[PDB]
Amino acid sequence: TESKELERLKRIDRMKTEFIANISHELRTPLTAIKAYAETIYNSLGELDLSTLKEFLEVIIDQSNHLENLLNELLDFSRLERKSLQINREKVDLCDLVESAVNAIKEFASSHNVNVLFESNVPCPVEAYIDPTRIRQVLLNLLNNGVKYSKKDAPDKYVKVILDEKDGGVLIIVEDNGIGIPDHAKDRIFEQFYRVDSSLTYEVPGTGLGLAITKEIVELHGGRIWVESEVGKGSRFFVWIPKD
């Protein structure tokens, strides 16, 4: 294997480099913006409108969150390669957790003409002892993939979240009529840096970490994640999580 093991590790290193290169340049933009807006407010104290003062500060905050997002992308990668990712379990109502997650990606789905739908197969006070942030992140990664990898010119594009109870834990299904995943890459999608060979004709951007961090979180919960997709009809992502 050694002859190919070098070839494999050498391939990973190229992608690791490209990721750091991209994220470094991305972090520069919000910072520049924060600096400019701060130095402008500072240089012009007591001389500007409350309305202007308000807007300029909102920009400082938006950019701070964007910078935080990117810094989290980097830290998530760091904790993944180091296998240092952790979880904090607490009682959360999953019905409103997925509902809050749906409402967060609604604006992004509208931009790509995609309907966001949440369906519950059981009464809605579904509670489990799980990490609320990290499972929300799992939900958002899957929802984002459903909007990003939808059909190009199709009449009724959707992403649907189906919440149920299987065996003894909780089962979440993220369904989409979208492009579907070819059967050769069915296992490869959860790997680090991996994207579909097509890349949707290179139109869609992505680091390929999404599903790798998702899997890791799901498994740290003592659960498993799998996919069922037809080559050109759509995709169903399956997440099962225990309860204490």
Partner: protein, 120 residues
């Protein structure tokens, strides 16, 4: 409502200046560098130009040169908004047709005062 051409290679500055302008009642057209400014000059004639100096492809001085050369571009009021410390640059700008040279960071009160000054 008047139309202003905002020329600067820094995106935050454009966003910052446009907001101030739009809050008053002016329409804003943006240009990421000197040449794109000339490219959008062929499309229409603006009432004012807010020009940066240091830009890629074409810097501010060159824009000023080619502004004073053409039939229609020569009579558009230009306000330079630059981060240049040296005031030798200010002389070089004012001579090339700049109706005012303001330093960065920009003060929305001082700026809006000058815009009204050149449009009335």
């Amino acid at each position: 409502s008047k139309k202003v051409l905002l020329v600067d290679d820094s995106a935050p500055i454009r966003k910052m200046v446009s907001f101030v302008l739009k809050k008053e009642g002016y329409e804003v057209i943006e240009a990421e560098n000197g040449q794109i400014a000339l490219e959008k000059l062929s499309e229409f004639t603006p009432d004012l130009i807010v020009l940066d100096i240091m830009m890629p492809v074409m810097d501010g001085f060159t824009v000023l040169k080619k502004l004073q050369e053409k039939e229609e571009w020569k009579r558009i009021p230009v306000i330079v908004l630059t981060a240049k410390g040296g005031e030798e640059d200010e002389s070089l700008a004012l001579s090339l047709g700049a109706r005012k040279v303001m330093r960065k960071p920009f003060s929305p009160s001082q700026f809006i005062e000058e815009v009204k000054h050149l449009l009335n």
